[PDB]
Amino acid sequence: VLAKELEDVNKWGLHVFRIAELSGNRPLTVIMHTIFQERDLLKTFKIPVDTLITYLMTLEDHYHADVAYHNNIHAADVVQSTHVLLSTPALEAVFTDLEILAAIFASAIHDVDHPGVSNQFLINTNSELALMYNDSSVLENHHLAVGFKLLQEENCDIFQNLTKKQRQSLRKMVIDIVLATDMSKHMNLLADLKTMVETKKVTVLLLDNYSDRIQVLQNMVHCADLSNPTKPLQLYRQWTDRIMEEFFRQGDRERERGMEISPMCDKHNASVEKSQVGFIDYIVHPLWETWADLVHPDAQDILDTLEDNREWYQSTIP
Amino acid sequence: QEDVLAKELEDVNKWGLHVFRIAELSGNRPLTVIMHTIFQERDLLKTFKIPVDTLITYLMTLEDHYHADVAYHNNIHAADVVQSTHVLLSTPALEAVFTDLEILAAIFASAIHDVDHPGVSNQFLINTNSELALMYNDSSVLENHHLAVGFKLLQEENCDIFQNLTKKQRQSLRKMVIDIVLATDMSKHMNLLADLKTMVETKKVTSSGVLLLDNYSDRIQVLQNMVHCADLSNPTKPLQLYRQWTDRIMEEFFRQGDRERERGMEISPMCDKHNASVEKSQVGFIDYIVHPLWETWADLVHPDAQDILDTLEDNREWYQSTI
Ligand SMILES: COc1cc2c(cc1OC)[C@H](CCc1c[nH]c3ccccc13)N(C=O)CC2
Ligand SMILES: COc1cc2c(cc1OC)[C@H](CCc1c[nH]c3ccccc13)N(C=O)CC2
Ligand SMILES: [Mg+2]
Ligand SMILES: [Mg+2]
Ligand SMILES: [Zn+2]
Ligand SMILES: [Zn+2]
């Protein structure tokens, strides 16, 4: 039953696809609602639960059901992954309840209205989105704008009972977190994380200034965004299938328009498995090794699964 | 009359061009006629194969999208920044330094750098939960908008003045223009000025004695600060020009403050027509913003800008003498 699967809401590797099916393609709504109850967020911020559900449904509706990866299931997955990373013991008592709400809300909206093509595609096709956003974090700026504008629909302002200062602080943190999910910022984000681990102070990690605390929240949601290869293989393999479909559909549009095919987007010359191994070796493992170092060692189980999954994918390559 | 306008446009290479008289003589088209004059002067139509009717059509559409009912951030301000940037480009310290494409980018960025400005600040737009601030996530809200509108108008009928640039030329120009206009966000001024000071302290010059700028970062930084200086050049102009710009920015500030007061908001600095000192605010503006910026630019191009800096210091003393 849907209720039984949700008991694992606090566990890495929740059966996200089964929850999507058992909720009638509403995992973002049911999982966000469950997170808000587990962290006592409706009462702490006086969010009418009907307003929460109405916003959540409207937000889920603006994820595209015909986009194979960047849809409402991905959003639900990043939300729940973030939720688990927030309860890392080494980050215990680090973030305020407003910051926790910030990270979770940001996770929920961080890909809304994604068209299934990359920023570079939007720039190179002279899209309306790239013209609006001057080629800079084109998607991420749009995800934020849509995620905030939907708060203005009827009975959707889940922040109505926040103070004016709380709303302003929340809005800034959400913007800083979602802008950091732009993959063109990964290396800089990683470097900041590495610097934090070399200068790491511990009693449990002590982060005194907002600059360091938002840095952790950015890398956290970024880690959640790039957490597919750290999940149990059966979940990882479905995410791989979905991202390859989206990449191949983008490559068909690049091909039909006569554009240079983006990396991993040519269905006629792609090694799905080799790309996964390179994705892990160059992006996901460096990131999660640093995150694990930061919270040494509450992430060892995550790092272990990632390395198991990398081993398995390598073994599929003759 | 076109004869009188033609005479006034003979000053287009001069600091302190009568830009308000050109606005009146051109039938409120200072941006169109000054851009057209400058493109003719720099041979840009021939260099970039820009059809004259396309240039005029774009310019008129662009000028149309400045607000005629905003006292400062209007098409006269845009024409002024264009013309000032045009003079700064000709400074001896930069002779043969920038390519035709970079000159085109700086001048085009100046022309569009405030288009569709509503006459209120970024902070006002953020604080009132404006659609603009919601679109741009509170980050360089106006400046992102000026760019988006300025580029979008190139798509209107017979408006693509870059139709004959190669694809890489358009790509390069687009990025430079974005880099330059985003740097006109006043919240970037301190970091921009800090970088300019570092460049001055580490400046290299070539055999001919011009600035050596051998990488994108340095070249774009000079163009960013050039256009920023032009944008903040009002107090460096002959006093009769400067005082008109002061009258206009203050009217715009006071109208914002009226909206803030009516909304029960705290009034922004310099926006309260009942607790304002025009003269002290100009002196603080020069002392904390304009003179540190222009003194640094003058150091970068020394001694090319000494007369402009002298005028700025004279005008500062004049305003101070009225307190
Ligand atoms: C499950 O597998 C994937 C998941 C995701 C991606 C790629 C996957 O598998 C190859 C790409 C990575 C984009 C990317 C940017 N720089 C890179 C450098 C190397 C590799 C990829 C990238 N995403 C796009 O939104 C995030 C989700
Ligand atoms: C001719 O006079 C003016 C012209 C301009 C301004 C102010 C003027 O006069 C006080 C303001 C400056 C805003 C500003 C940002 N930080 C500051 C610190 C101190 C003072 C002002 C500012 N502008 C607004 O678009 C640019 C043009
Ligand atoms: Mg994204
Ligand atoms: Mg401006
Ligand atoms: Zn994502
Ligand atoms: Zn301006």
Short mmCIF file of all heavy atoms in Angstrom, two decimals, chain A residues 110-111 140 143 181, ligand 3:
data_model
loop_
_atom_site.label_atom_id
_atom_site.label_comp_id
_atom_site.label_asym_id
_atom_site.label_seq_id
_atom_site.Cartn_x
_atom_site.Cartn_y
_atom_site.Cartn_z
N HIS A 110 13.13 22.46 -7.85
CA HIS A 110 14.41 22.78 -8.50
C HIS A 110 14.46 22.44 -9.99
O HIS A 110 15.38 22.90 -10.67
CB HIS A 110 15.57 22.07 -7.80
CG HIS A 110 15.80 20.68 -8.29
ND1 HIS A 110 14.99 19.62 -7.93
CD2 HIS A 110 16.73 20.17 -9.14
CE1 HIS A 110 15.41 18.53 -8.52
NE2 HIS A 110 16.48 18.82 -9.25
N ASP A 111 13.52 21.62 -10.52
CA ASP A 111 13.49 21.33 -11.95
C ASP A 111 12.12 21.61 -12.59
O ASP A 111 11.86 21.15 -13.71
CB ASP A 111 13.90 19.87 -12.22
CG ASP A 111 15.42 19.69 -12.33
OD1 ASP A 111 16.13 20.66 -12.69
OD2 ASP A 111 15.89 18.56 -12.04
N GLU A 140 17.64 26.94 -14.53
CA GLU A 140 17.55 27.08 -13.09
C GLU A 140 16.84 28.37 -12.70
O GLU A 140 16.06 28.40 -11.75
CB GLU A 140 18.96 27.02 -12.48
CG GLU A 140 19.63 25.63 -12.57
CD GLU A 140 20.09 25.25 -13.98
OE1 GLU A 140 20.34 26.16 -14.80
OE2 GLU A 140 20.19 24.03 -14.27
N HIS A 143 13.20 27.51 -13.37
CA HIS A 143 12.62 26.65 -12.33
C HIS A 143 12.23 27.48 -11.11
O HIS A 143 11.14 27.32 -10.55
CB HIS A 143 13.60 25.53 -11.90
CG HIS A 143 14.10 24.68 -13.03
ND1 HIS A 143 13.28 24.17 -14.02
CD2 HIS A 143 15.35 24.22 -13.32
CE1 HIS A 143 13.99 23.45 -14.87
NE2 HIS A 143 15.26 23.47 -14.47
N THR A 181 22.24 24.23 -8.54
CA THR A 181 22.06 22.95 -9.22
C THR A 181 22.44 23.01 -10.69
O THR A 181 22.38 21.97 -11.37
CB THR A 181 20.62 22.46 -9.09
OG1 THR A 181 19.74 23.36 -9.78
CG2 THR A 181 20.22 22.33 -7.61
MG MG C 3 18.13 21.00 -12.87
#
